[PDB]
């Protein structure tokens, strides 16, 4: 009868209340904390009337009806529309890059005091600020981040040196939050732009790598249940997402013998810890001496009959069989092989002799496997030579030349994120490097696709982003220097810095230099790597020299003019 009562009962007042706060923050990102807290309290007092009496008026209503009505008391176009169009309108208006105050943390003393004086308000502000900045944040994991954010303050505010305890933990959580957010953003883009089949294929590959001793039918069941969880979360159905996620963790832990040997310690833990643990669990050991796929998938004359019975189940079995054997392959690689196999059956199963045209399909896989292997090898060697910062600069120039229509702040941000692949993957042995590197790259290029989507100025970004989810990385890699781009005019201010540059962090100084490098390339897209290296070396040299001087403002002014002069000397006005 009452859905609001059902969810309230299933999750309990605390997680119900946290999940409604997250929903409202993700839908109305510009709305004040105080206003959301009130809407949550009102809905929550209502839900309890529905728990106590299921036939109580408006307890029969859908969650979307109840939640949109409350949101609409404070909201715009979307409040004129009715369900289901209203919810769709809200989803459509989620802002990936909200124009919001850049959030600064006070002294540790201030923070610890606030935590003691107003614990509940302090933890609710955390949920609110994270959710409005990251409107696709996986709501159940955000409950876990909040739990760990609380443990950080509880421990570190007792400590002898608080700042020493607390700051490295807020930095780990902040960094892991951005990783969790980027990953969830890609799951939602898959569902919303490429459909449930795209996500199901991703899930079959990933779960098959993790749970290789699981039977295909077990893996299919988990894929069904996991697909339902992410469909609900990405559609703003947060109460049912968290509910259904808690149910999947329960199922998995009660069937460890059908799934994995690695779950025992995860399935001891409390609900939020357990769900997180299962999600990040290590790949099980492969069943020993699994046979070659050739017999049932390329040499059998029954391939098309088997395809005909159930296209998606047969392609599922192929993906499962391939993925469980290759923990050492990227999930996008496995999806590229299955998609190749599929296009091969679509052509070949219509032939008088299907076996003759599909017999060499495994030959088609060799170059598909080698291309990522050679990309990682090649970029890890550059990484080892250059180091992170200079590796980022190399990728900056590369991508500014591919897609020079893209905004400077977007090129700098995406290129810095691209360059972090080096540190996060190149240290791994070559049996872990491909999934580390290439699935991370898929997450970062999705960031490019979503930052560019609202005002899609680069046709080649749009093509690479829309043509094929699974081909995105190769598509970007293959992009040539854009010969059609008309160079932009150069503002002299690009190379004109001020004294306070000396007061910024190493990271901010690099971003200033990376910003200038992009503005150079956009002005002189034919400029050599050697010519750009000279200019950038002079830049570094000028900032070090000027930050040492007594008259810093003077030094920067003069050296700016020198650099512009030298620049124009080497590459032109």
């Amino acid at each position: 009868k009452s859905e609001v009562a059902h969810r309230f009962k299933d999750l309990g007042e605390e997680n119900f209340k946290a999940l409604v706060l997250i929903a409202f923050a993700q839908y109305l990102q510009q709305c004040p904390f105080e206003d959301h807290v009130k809407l949550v309290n009102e809905v929550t007092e209502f839900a309890k009337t529905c728990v106590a009496d299921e036939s109580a008026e408006n307890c029969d209503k859908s969650l979307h009806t109840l939640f949109g009505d409350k949101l609409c008391t404070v909201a715009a176009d979307c409040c004129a529309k009715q369900e289901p169009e209203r919810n769709e309108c809200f989803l459509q208006h989620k802002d990936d890059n909200p124009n919001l105050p850049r959030l600064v943390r006070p002294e540790v003393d201030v923070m610890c005091t606030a935590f003691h004086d107003n614990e509940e308000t302090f933890l609710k502000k955390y949920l609110y600020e994270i959710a409005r900045r990251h409107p696709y944040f996986y709501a159940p994991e955000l409950l876990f981040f909040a739990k760990r954010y609380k443990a950080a303050f509880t421990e570190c505010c007792q400590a002898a040196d608080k700042a020493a305890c607390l700051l490295p933990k807020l930095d780990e959580l902040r960094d892991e939050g951005k990783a969790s957010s980027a990953k969830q953003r890609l799951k939602c883009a898959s569902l919303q732009k490429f459909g449930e089949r795209a996500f199901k294929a991703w899930a079959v590959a990933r779960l098959s790598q993790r749970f290789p001793k699981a039977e295909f039918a077990e893996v299919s069941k988990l894929v069904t249940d996991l697909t339902k969880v992410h469909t609900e979360c990405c559609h703003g159905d947060l109460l049912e997402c968290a509910d259904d996620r808690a149910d999947l963790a329960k199922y998995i832990c009660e069937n460890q013998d059908s799934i994995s040997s690695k779950l025992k310690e995860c399935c001891e833990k409390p609900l939020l810890e357990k769900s997180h643990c299962i999600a990040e669990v290590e790949n099980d050991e492969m069943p020993a001496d699994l046979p070659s796929l050739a017999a049932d998938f390329v040499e059998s004359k029954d391939v098309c009959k088997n395809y005909a019975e159930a296209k998606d189940v047969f392609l599922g079995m192929f993906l499962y069989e391939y993925a469980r054997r290759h923990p050492d392959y990227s999930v996008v690689l496995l999806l590229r092989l299955a998609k190749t196999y599929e296009t091969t059956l679509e052509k070949c199963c219509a032939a008088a002799d299907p076996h003759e045209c599909y017999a060499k399909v495994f030959d088609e896989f060799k170059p598909l496997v080698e291309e990522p292997q050679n990309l990682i090898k090649q970029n890890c060697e550059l990484f080892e030579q250059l180091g992170e910062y200079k590796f980022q600069n190399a990728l900056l120039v590369r991508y500014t030349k591919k897609v020079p229509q893209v905004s400077t702040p977007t090129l700098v941000e995406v290129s810095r994120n691209l360059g972090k692949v080096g540190s996060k993957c190149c240290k791994h042995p070559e049996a872990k490097r491909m999934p580390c590197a290439e699935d991370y790259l898929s997450v970062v290029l999705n960031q490019l696709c979503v930052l560019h989507e609202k005002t899609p100025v680069s046709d080649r970004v749009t093509k690479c982003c829309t043509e094929s989810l699974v081909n995105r990385r190769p598509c970007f890699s293959a992009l040539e220097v854009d010969e059609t781009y008309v160079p932009k005019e150069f503002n002299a201010e690009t190379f004109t810095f001020h004294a306070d540059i000396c007061t910024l962090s190493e990271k901010e100084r690099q971003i200033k230099k990376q910003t200038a490098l992009v503005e150079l390339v956009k002005h002189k897209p034919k400029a050599t790597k050697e010519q750009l290296k000279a200019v950038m070396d002079d830049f570094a040299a000028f900032v070090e020299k000027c930050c040492k001087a007594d008259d810093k403002e003077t030094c920067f002014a003069e050296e700016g003019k020198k650099l512009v002069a030298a620049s124009q000397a080497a590459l032109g006005l």
Binding site: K301, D302, V303, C304, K305, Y307, A308, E309, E346, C349, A350, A351, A352, D353, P354, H355
Partner: protein
């Protein structure tokens, strides 16, 4: 589920003709190459004929070349075998299969050619 139903078999004299039908259900018939195979008593199975999904491409075993014609009606989701100048050696259960599968997945239809 894929369903294949053969008919048109019979007991016939050498030099007579028979037309076999295969009613296919549960898949996009037109997307799939189709086959006839036969099982004679005391013999290995024998591939007879294959036809592309369009009906444009046609293959035959040497044992039936010049006598049998494979064809299909995509609209009626039906495969045909026109068997002329039948011979004692042609005696077998005939079954249609998808895409050159050799295994019988159907009731089939008995053709007996009696001297």
């Amino acid at each position: 589920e894929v369903q294949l139903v053969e008919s048109g078999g019979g007991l016939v004299q050498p030099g007579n003709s028979l037309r076999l039908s295969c009613a296919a259900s549960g898949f996009t018939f037109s997307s799939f190459g189709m086959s006839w195979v036969r099982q004679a008593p005391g013999k290995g199975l024998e591939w007879v004929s294959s036809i592309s999904g369009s009906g444009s491409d046609t293959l035959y075993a040497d044992s039936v070349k010049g006598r049998f014609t494979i064809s299909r009606d995509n609209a009626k989701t039906t495969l045909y075998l026109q068997m002329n100048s039948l011979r004692p050696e042609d005696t077998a259960v005939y079954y249609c299969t998808i895409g050159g599968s050799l295994s019988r997945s159907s009731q089939g239809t008995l053709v007996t050619v009696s001297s």
